[PDB]
C-alpha cells in the first residue's frame, strides 16, 4: 500500500523560469542520506550546481554544498559505502567527497580528476566482491546463516591478498576512456586511452562488471543508423601504468525498423542502460519521440556467441 510521507519546501525558492531546464539526477548513501540538486537560475549559476543533503529525521536542517562547476551536474552517485561521492559533469571536474569529522553537516573534497575538451558519457566505480543472498522462502529457518549466506562474486583485481582494489572508470563522449585507481597508499594512478580507432559521438552508454575484474561497456551514437557496439576492459598494470586492451564484442542492431511500416518514428535514442550495475547481459533501450516512448530489453543469452534478444513491452508509454 502506497503512502506519501511529506513535502519539505523552502519559502520563496520555487518557480524556476527564463532558463533552459535540465533533467536532474539524485543519489543516496548506504546510510539514510539523500543527495539531491535542482535547477534554479536565480542571479547565479551555482544554484543549478548546488548540493543538498537531508538527514532522514529532521528535513529542515539541510546540509548545503556549493559545488562550483563550469558545466551543470548530469549524473549523481554515492559510494557503495557512505564515504565517497561523485558529481558527474562534462569536461572532467570530478572530485572525491569524504566525510568530515563524523558530523551531520560537514563535507570536504581536496582530490579529484579532470579531462579537457571531452565530456563523459558513462562512469562507474570499482568492485568489492562481497554479496549475500536473501531468502524470503527461509522465513522459518530460524538461523541467520540460512536466510543470509554469501553468493561470493569474484572481487575485482585482488592485489596483495584478497582485497580488491579501489577506483573508478569512465567512458567519455568521444572515442576515449579513463581510469583512476586509488593506491593502498595515498597516491592515485590515472590512465586515459582511446577506446578504439573509431573516435565518435556517443549519446548514451553504460558500464557493468563481469566475474573476474573485467568490465563490459555499451555504446550509443544517436544517429539511428549505427550498430550498438560493445567493448571489454582488460585490466593490466604493467609495472608503472594500467595498460588496457580493448576488443569488440558481438554487437546488435535495433528492432522496430526492419518491419518497413514506420522506421523514422522515435528518431533519436533517449535511454540506454543495463538492468543493474555490475552485470552486462540485460539492456534497457528506450527511444522517446515528442509524444511517446518505446522500451526494449535485450538479453545476452548464448544461442553469434553473444546475441541480444527481446523480452517484453507494455501497452502504452508517455515520454519518460
Amino acid at each position: 500500500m502506497m503512502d506519501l510521507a511529506y513535502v519539505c519546501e523552502w519559502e520563496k525558492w520555487s518557480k524556476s523560469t527564463h532558463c533552459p531546464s535540465v533533467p536532474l539526477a539524485c543519489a543516496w548513501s548506504c546510510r539514510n542520506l539523500i543527495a539531491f540538486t535542482m535547477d534554479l537560475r536565480s542571479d547565479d549559476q551555482d544554484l543549478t550546481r548546488m548540493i543538498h543533503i537531508l538527514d532522514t529525521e529532521h528535513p529542515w536542517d539541510l546540509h548545503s554544498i556549493p559545488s562550483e562547476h563550469h558545466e551543470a551536474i548530469t549524473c549523481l552517485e554515492w559510494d557503495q559505502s557512505g564515504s565517497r561521492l561523485l558529481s558527474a559533469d562534462a569536461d572532467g571536474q570530478i572530485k572525491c567527497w569524504s566525510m568530515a569529522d563524523h558530523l551531520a553537516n560537514s563535507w570536504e573534497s581536496s582530490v579529484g580528476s579532470l579531462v579537457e575538451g571531452d565530456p563523459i558519457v558513462a562512469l562507474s566505480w570499482l568492485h568489492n566482491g562481497v554479496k549475500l543472498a536473501l531468502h524470503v522462502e527461509k522465513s522459518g529457518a530460524s538461523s541467520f546463516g540460512e536466510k543470509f549466506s554469501r553468493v561470493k562474486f569474484s572481487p575485482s583485481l585482488t592485489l596483495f591478498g584478497g582485497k580488491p582494489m579501489e577506483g573508478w572508470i569512465a567512458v567519455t563522449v568521444s572515442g576515449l576512456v579513463t581510469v583512476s585507481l586509488l593506491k593502498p597508499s595515498g597516491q592515485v594512478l590515472t590512465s586515459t586511452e582511446s577506446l578504439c580507432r573509431l573516435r565518435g559521438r556517443v549519446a548514451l552508454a553504460d558500464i557493468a562488471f563481469t566475474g573476474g575484474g573485467n568490465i563490459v561497456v555499451a555504446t550509443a551514437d544517436g544517429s539511428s543508423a549505427s550498430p550498438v557496439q560493445f567493448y571489454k576492459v582488460c585490466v593490466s598494470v604493467v609495472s608503472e601504468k594500467c595498460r588496457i586492451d580493448t576488443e569488440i564484442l558481438p554487437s546488435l542492431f535495433m528492432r522496430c525498423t526492419t518491419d518497413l511500416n514506420r522506421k523514422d518514428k522515435f528518431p533519436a535514442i533517449t535511454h540506454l542502460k543495463f538492468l543493474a550495475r555490475d552485470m552486462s547481459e540485460q539492456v534497457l533501450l528506450c527511444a522517446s519521440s515528442q509524444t511517446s516512448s518505446i522500451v526494449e530489453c535485450w538479453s545476452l543469452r548464448k544461442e553469434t556467441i553473444l546475441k541480444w534478444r527481446i523480452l517484453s513491452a507494455t501497452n502504452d508509454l508517455d515520454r519518460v
Binding site: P20, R199, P227, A268
Partner: protein
Amino acid sequence: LLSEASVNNLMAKRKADREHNIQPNIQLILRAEPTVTNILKTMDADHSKSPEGLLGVLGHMLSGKSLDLLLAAAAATGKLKSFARKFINLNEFTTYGSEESTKPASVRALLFDISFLMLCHVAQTYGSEVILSESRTGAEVPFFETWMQTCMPEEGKILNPDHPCFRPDSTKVESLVALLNNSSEMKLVQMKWHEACLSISAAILEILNAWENGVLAFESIQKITDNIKGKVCSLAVCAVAWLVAHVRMLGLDEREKSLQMIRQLAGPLFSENTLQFYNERVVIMNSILERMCADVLQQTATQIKFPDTMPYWNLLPPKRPIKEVLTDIFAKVLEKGWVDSRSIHIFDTLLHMGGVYWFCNNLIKELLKETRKEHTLRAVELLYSIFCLDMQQVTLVLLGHILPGLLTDSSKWHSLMDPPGTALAKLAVWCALSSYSSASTRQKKRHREDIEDYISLFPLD
C-alpha cells in the same frame, strides 16, 4: 560584354609586356565544350538508338582525361544535373535489355558499364545530390537511384545492410552462387542487370560462407573470381560492394579472411576476354574502388593495389585531441592574407563531427587576445565566411546562448571593448541581415535527424 576598340591597344601593351608541343588545357576546354554540348544533345536519342556510332565515338573520344573534360565543363556550366538526369534513363533502358545476338548484347553490356563508369566518379567527387533527381513518378523507379542510396560506403556514411532492400530474395541467389561455379557466363543476351546486381550481394554471402566452411576447392574459387572479371567487371564491383558492407560489423580479427576474395576480385587485370576498350576500363574503375573501399582500408590495414585523383582525404591525426589542431590553422590563414582551398576540406570534417556549440566556445575565448583593430577585423572577416558555412545555424546560436553568455556575469564584458566589441557587433549585423534575406550536402545531412524544443530553451518571456 567588352567592345573591340579597347581590345586592340591592350593587345599592343600585352605584346610589349610579353616581349620582356605542350598544349595547355585552355584551348582543350575551348574545343572540348562544343563536343560536350553535342554529345549531351545526342545522348537524348542514343545516336538514334544505333549503338555502333556511339561505340565508335566513345572509342575516338577516349584519350587522356576525356571524361574529366566533360565533367569539369558540365559542373562549371551547371549542366551536370542534366548529365546525371539523362544517363539515369539510359541506365533504365540498358539494365533490362532487348533481344540481341552476342555482339550487340556485348555493346549493350558496355553501355551498362561505361555510363556506370561515367557517373561513379561524379558520386565520389561532386557529391551524391547531383545524381539523385529526388522526384520519380510511379513504381517504375530507376535501378541506378536504388543503387545510389545503398551501394557505396562513404568516409562519413556507412551502409546499414540489414535492410530488406539488401536482402530481396534467397532462391535466386542460389542460382547466382551455382552458375558462377560452372564456367563463363555466355548468357548476357538477356540477363536483367538489375536483378543480378542485387542478388550478387547475397551470392557473395554464400561465397564467403562456403569459403569459411572450406568444403570447396580454393582453385575453383580462383577460377570463379577470375571469371567475373573476364568480360564485364561490373559484377566484380557488385561482388566487392556488399563484401565491403559486410566487413564493417565484423571485428578486425574477422575481416582479413574475406579480403582474400577481395584482393582476388580487383588485383591484376585479366586478359583474353577483351570485348573492346578493356585496359582503360580497369583503370577507371580502380579509382572508383579506391574511394569506395577507403573506409575499410583505413580500418583493415591491408593492400589491394587496384592499379591519383585523391585530393582531400583523411590527413588527420588518429588520437590527438582536435582542439590544438583546430585552432592553429586560423592564425596561419590570417598571416597568409588569403584562405587555402586545401584548408576548406580540412575544416569540413572538423565542423562536421565535433558539435557547433563547442566550436563557437573555442573561438570566442580566442577572440580576446587582440588590441589592434585591423588585426582583429581580419579574423572577424574570415569568421564571417566560416560562419556563413552554416549561417542558418550561427544566426540562431550566436543570438541564442552566446549573447546571453556574453552579459550574464559582471566582469565578462571587460573583454567587450573598442576593437573586439565593435568587430563582433559588425559580425553579428552582417549575418543577421543575410539570415533575413535567407553550402554543402553534409549540412543537409546533419540537419535532418535532430529535433529541439526551442520554447523550452527560450519561452519568449
